[PDB]
């Protein structure tokens, strides 16, 4: 109440795994620049992959 405060959570991490692909299929990737008008932060919110 006043002199003793009980247990109370502070923070929380929800950590996830990645998105897999095929080993034998072979990745081919190239870097492109963003389109700035799109809200790119909206796409990257959730921790689940």
């Amino acid at each position: 109440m006043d002199k003793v405060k009980l247990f109370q959570t502070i923070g929380r991490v929800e950590y996830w795994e990645r998105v897999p692909r095929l080993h034998a299929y072979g990745v081919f990737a190239l870097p492109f620049p963003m389109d700035p008008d799109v809200n790119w932060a909206q796409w990257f919110t959730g921790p689940h992959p």
């Binding site: 081919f28 990737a29 190239l30 870097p31």
Partner: protein
């Protein structure tokens, strides 16, 4: 003209000019997690000279 001596008649100077390919170019910029892209082709030249 400091003097010099030889035993033969005619004097041939053969100059070999060399324009090596100059080490130019910057490394290409990319993002981590990408397949690389190759470099351009450069040229070296050799010319000679007779006197």
């Amino acid at each position: 003209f400091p003097e010099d001596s030889t035993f033969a008649s005619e004097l041939e100077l053969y100059l070999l000019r060399t324009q090596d390919a100059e080490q130019t170019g910057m490394t290409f910029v990319h993002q981590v997690g990408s397949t690389s892209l190759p470099v351009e082709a450069r040229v070296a030249k050799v010319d000679l000279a007779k006197a």
